[PDB]
């Protein structure tokens, strides 16, 4: 696929596997809630999210920017605040996963900022080229 | 002379990872229960068991035969029956994990019988060796 998107998605996957998934006791966040185990969950939570889903989205290049990636990461926490309550142990774990994500993004800030820019510019460039043919 | 023990443990580990862990949406059975998330679990359950624990046991050659392995596998279902109840969906998943394990052991039954015998024979030749 396109080189800059491949590079941006490579970094996001390292943040999920290297940092977020390594949070202790984070495993209940690694896959979607089993509707059979938790029948209520899909009734209450309008937008389920988990780290496997984010990895598949990365692999499909859903995320062209840090902001779209963070929207899905933040939903993991919001869903736990809502379903499990804001002081619940599940929510403390979710907050740790969100916190390591933001900390790790800050570390790749320079590169990610540039890649984001490069992907935006290329899109408008392809539409401009198609106009000129 | 632990070649047969190593080969036996290799087969059990692959039953765990390729068969038992591959039962769908069975993640909760792949890790020990942590009392922080299910604070009442250990009021009820004496001897916890999970598939990551069984993998650790196999890596240390805990099991010299099917009987000791199956004690641990069957403990996973017995604990879900007790904690979640016999008709819980958690129990229904634990029963699929046990059934795919028995099914696979039955496929490999004659080879596992042979490895179990050779594990005992190696140990004996060594005990006779050591005894004198």
């Amino acid at each position: 696929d396109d080189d800059d998107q491949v590079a941006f998605s490579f970094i996001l996957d390292n943040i999920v596997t290297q940092k977020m998934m390594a949070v202790p006791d984070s495993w209940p966040f690694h896959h979607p809630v089993n509707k059979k185990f938790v029948p209520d969950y899909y009734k209450v939570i309008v937008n389920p999210m988990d780290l496997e889903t984010i990895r598949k989205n990365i692999s499909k290049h859903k995320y062209q920017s840090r902001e779209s990636f963070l929207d899905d990461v933040n939903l993991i926490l919001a869903n736990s605040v809502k379903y499990n309550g804001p002081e619940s142990q599940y929510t403390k774990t979710a907050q740790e996963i969100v916190n390591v994500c933001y900390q790790t993004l800050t570390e790749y800030d320079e590169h990610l900022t540039q890649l984001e820019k490069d992907i935006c510019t290329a899109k408008e460039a392809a539409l401009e080229e198609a106009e000129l043919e | 002379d632990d070649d047969d023990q190593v080969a036996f443990s290799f087969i059990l580990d692959n039953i765990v990872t390729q068969k038992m862990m591959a039962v769908p949406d069975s993640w909760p059975f792949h890790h020990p229960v942590n009392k922080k998330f299910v604070p009442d679990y250990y009021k009820v359950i004496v001897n916890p068991m999970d598939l990551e624990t069984i993998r650790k046991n196999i890596s240390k050659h805990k099991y010299q035969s099917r009987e000791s392995f199956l004690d641990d596998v069957n403990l996973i279902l017995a604990n879900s029956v007790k904690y979640n109840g016999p008709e819980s969906q958690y129990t229904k998943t634990a029963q699929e994990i046990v059934n795919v394990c028995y099914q696979t052991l039955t496929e490999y039954d004659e080879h596992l019988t042979q490895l179990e015998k050779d594990i005992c024979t190696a140990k004996e030749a060594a005990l006779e060796e050591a005894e004198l």
Partner: peptide, 7 residues
Amino acid sequence: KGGKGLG
């Protein structure tokens, strides 16, 4: 199960 659904 356990603390799940407490909110």
